[PDB]
C-alpha cells in the first residue's frame, strides 16, 4: 500500500543538470524507481 516520498527528493534527480547533460534515461529510471520502492 503506497509510499510516502518528499517532493524535494524526486526533484533532486532532475535538477543535477540541464536536460541535455543528464545521465541516460535508464540510469534516471533506476534512481526514481529506487526512491519509490516498497523496501
Amino acid at each position: 500500500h503506497a509510499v510516502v516520498v518528499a517532493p524535494q527528493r524526486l526533484a533532486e534527480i532532475f535538477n543535477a543538470a540541464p536536460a541535455f547533460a543528464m545521465p541516460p534515461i535508464e540510469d534516471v529510471f533506476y534512481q526514481v524507481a529506487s526512491l519509490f520502492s516498497t523496501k
Binding site: 500500500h1 503506497a2 509510499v3 516520498v5 517532493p7 524526486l10 526533484a11 534527480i13 532532475f14 535538477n15 540541464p18 536536460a19 541535455f20 543528464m22 541516460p24 534515461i25 535508464e26 534516471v28 529510471f29 533506476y30 526514481v32 524507481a33 529506487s34 519509490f36 520502492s37 516498497t38 523496501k39
Partner: protein, 411 residues
C-alpha cells in the same frame, strides 16, 4: 519595424539588414547543419532555397500558408537537438526573419526551445516573442519575459503540475517528435522529468484520464526506447502511490509487455514488479504471465531486482496464472514454470502454501498427464529447503496424502 526582432543581431543592426544579408549569413549555418545531418538537406529546396529570400507570406492562400506552417513545424522538430550550436540558431533566425515564425508558429517555437530554458538563447527568444501570440498555456513565462532571466526548472514543474494544458502541450510535442524520429536524448529526459514531478505533484496535492493515452502510446514506441523507459518511470510512480485500481494496473502491465523490446527489457521488468506489488488481486493476467517468462533466467533476474524492490507478488501472480492454466487446460508445459518459480524462494510461506494447495486441486480438476503432474507434485514435496517445509506443512493442512500417490505413481 518587426524587422528588428532577431536572435543574433541587436535591434540597431537588425533594422538595417537586407534579406540578402540575412540570407547569406544564415544559409551558412544551415549548410553546416547539413554537413552534420543529411535530414536537413530536403529543406535546401524549400525553407532555405534561394527563392525563399523573396517569399512574402501575406500573398499566400490559406492552404499555402498551412503547408508552409507544416514545413516550419517539421524543421523545428529536426533542429531541436542542436539549439546549443550557433548554426542551428542561425537557421531558426532565417525562419524568424523571413517567415516570421515567431508570429505564425509561436507554440511550436516555444516548445522546441523549452528543454533549453536555462541557456541564454532561451531568454533571447523570449525577448522577441510577440506576447499577443504566446499561447495561453505558456503565459506563466510572463515574469521571465519582463525580467529577462531564465525560468528555474521548478517554475516549469509547478505550472505543469497545476495547469494540465502545459503538460498536454509538452507531451504532444515530444510524441510528434518520436513519431517523426526527430527525438533526441534531452527531449526525452525533459519530458520525463516534467511528467514525473508533475504527476507526483498532481496526486500529492489531491490527498488523470488525460495523460493515460500519452503513457500508453509511449509504451509502444519500439523505435524510441528512451520514450518507452521514460514512460516506465511515470507509470512506476503512478502505481507506487496507491493511485490506481487493479483493472487499470493490469492494462498498464498488459501494455508494457505488449510494447517492450530487448533494449527496454530490464527497466520494464522492475516496473512490472512495482505494478503487481500494488495490485490487491493476486493472480496476474494471462497476457503478462506468457510474456514475463520469456526473460532468459527469469528467476535470477527477479532475484537481482529483489535487492532494491519487492518481487514476491509478481512471482506469486505468475505461479497462480500458470497453475490456473493447468487447472483449465491440462497443459504439462506449465509444470517447469510452476516448479522453478515455487522453488525460487521469492514467494513467502503462505504464498507458497496456497500456491501448492491450488496446484493440488488443479491436478484434481482434470479428467499421460496424471503421470507428470503427479510426479511434479511428488518432486516438489521432497524439496530440500524452506519451500519444501512450506509445501509439506501445506500438505498436512489439506489432508492430502502424497504417499498413496508416491506409490501409485510408482506402479
Amino acid at each position: 519595424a518587426s524587422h528588428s526582432k532577431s536572435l543574433i543581431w541587436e535591434p540597431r543592426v537588425a533594422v538595417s539588414q537586407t534579406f540578402a544579408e540575412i540570407y547569406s549569413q544564415c544559409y551558412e549555418g544551415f549548410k553546416e547543419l547539413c554537413h552534420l545531418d543529411s535530414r536537413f538537406v530536403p529543406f535546401d529546396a524549400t525553407l532555405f532555397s534561394a527563392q525563399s529570400q523573396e517569399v512574402d507570406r501575406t500573398q499566400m492562400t490559406a492552404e499555402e500558408n498551412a503547408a508552409l506552417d507544416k514545413r516550419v513545424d517539421s524543421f523545428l522538430h529536426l533542429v531541436g537537438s542542436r539549439l546549443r550550436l550557433m548554426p542551428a540558431i542561425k537557421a531558426v533566425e532565417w525562419l524568424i526573419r523571413r517567415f516570421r515564425i515567431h508570429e505564425f508558429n509561436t507554440g511550436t517555437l516555444l516548445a522546441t526551445f523549452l528543454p533549453y530554458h536555462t541557456i541564454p538563447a532561451f531568454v533571447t527568444l523570449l525577448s522577441i516573442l510577440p506576447v499577443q501570440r504566446i499561447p495561453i498555456e505558456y503565459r506563466f513565462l510572463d515574469p521571465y519575459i519582463k525580467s529577462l532571466t531564465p525560468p528555474p526548472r521548478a517554475a516549469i514543474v509547478q505550472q505543469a503540475t497545476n495547469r494540465p494544458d502545459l503538460l498536454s502541450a509538452i507531451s504532444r510535442y515530444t510524441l510528434d517528435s518520436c513519431r517523426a524520429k526527430q527525438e533526441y536524448p534531452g527531449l526525452i529526459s525533459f519530458w520525463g522529468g516534467i511528467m514525473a514531478e508533475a504527476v507526483n505533484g498532481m496526486i500529492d496535492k489531491m490527498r488523470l484520464q488525460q495523460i493515460g493515452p500519452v503513457l500508453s502510446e509511449a509504451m509502444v514506441m519500439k523505435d524510441v526506447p528512451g520514450i518507452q523507459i521514460a514512460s516506465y518511470m511515470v507509470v512506476a510512480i503512478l502505481a507506487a502511490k496507491g493511485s490506481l485500481n487493479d483493472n487499470i494496473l493490469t492494462a498498464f502491465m498488459e501494455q508494457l509487455v505488449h510494447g517492450w523490446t530487448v533494449d527496454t527489457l530490464r527497466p520494464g521488468l522492475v516496473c512490472l514488479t512495482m505494478l503487481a506489488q500494488h495490485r490487491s488481486a493476486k493472480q496476474l493476467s494471462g497476457r503478462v504471465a506468457k510474456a514475463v517468462i520469456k526473460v532468459p533466467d527469469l528467476v535470477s533476474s527477479l532475484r537481482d531486482i529483489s535487492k532494491e524492490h519487492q518481487v514476491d507478488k509478481l512471482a506469486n501472480g505468475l505461479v497462480l496464472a500458470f497453475v490456473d492454466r493447468l487447472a483449465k487446460k491440462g497443459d504439462i508445459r506449465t509444470l517447469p514454470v510452476i516448479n522453478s518459480l515455487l522453488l525460487s524462494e521469492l514467494l513467502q510461506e503462505k504464498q507458497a502454501k496456497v500456491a501448492y494447495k491450488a496446484l493440488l486441486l488443479a491436478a484434481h480438476k482434470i479428467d499421460n498427464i496424471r503421470k507428470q503432474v503427479g510426479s511434479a507434485l511428488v518432486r516438489l514435496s521432497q524439496a530440500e529447503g524452506d519451500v519444501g517445509d512450506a509445501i509439506r506443512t501445506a500438505i498436512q493442512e489439506v489432508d492430502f496424502n502424497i504417499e498413496e500417490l508416491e506409490l501409485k505413481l510408482g506402479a
